[PDB]
């Protein structure tokens, strides 16, 4: 969503479900904005 950063470790996608943009985490990352490394 523009050049103002939202998701950390992932791709941004619109959740028409909750009507707010969500983050699609890449492997080994968790969180609402994919901000954490999952050490497990």
């Amino acid at each position, epitope marked *: 969503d523009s050049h103002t950063q939202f998701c950390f470790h992932g791709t941004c996608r619109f959740l028409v479900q909750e009507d707010k943009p969500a983050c699609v985490c890449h492997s080994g990352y*968790v969180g609402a904005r994919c901000e954490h490394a*999952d050490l497990l």
Partner: antibody
Amino acid sequence: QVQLVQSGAEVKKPGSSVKVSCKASGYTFTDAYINWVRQAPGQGLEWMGWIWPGPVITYYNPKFKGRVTITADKSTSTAYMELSSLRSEDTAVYYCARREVLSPFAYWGQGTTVTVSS
Amino acid sequence: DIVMTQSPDSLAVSLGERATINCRSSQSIVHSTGNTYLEWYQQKPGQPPKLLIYKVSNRFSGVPDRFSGSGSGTDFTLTISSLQAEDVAVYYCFHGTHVPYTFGGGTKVEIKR
């Protein structure tokens, strides 16, 4: 204005389960994590897990072996903490704390005393 | 999984004297953005913890200037310049960089007499 309000004390027999509640007010509920911390007597602090209520997301402390369950009521701005198969070791003050993305535990609930006894 | 280790354990410091609490992470706790989500909390009996320091060195709004945090990737310290009667509590470091989140063991500060 930001308040985290927990339910009252519990006495639960060994083996049973306990649901602790947390009413959150003064901010948008889908915009912060609701964390859970516990503290057994004389003992230090133990993070249990977290919940993002928006597009619902959880992460728990593995040391609990999936006994802890964190739910969120969008309608009533409450996040629940359910802990199953209660042991004497689970006797503690259960806390909930607010955390914004990569921000600290600025807000805390008063605590909930759960006593596990026969 | 990260192991936060508080070095002092129990600290007895006279009034107005300097108090230093040490904490250590087993693995690096530097976030991908280059920030380190290490925080200090103060807890008094029959009370929920209070935020003191966040992001290693940032003093939370309303915290007296006597409180200050500092660190280096795995080693971190909480400092009280001049101990006050009010500062007698248990201090916890916290790691919120990586999941799972980790609390330290805690350090009791008492008045040395």
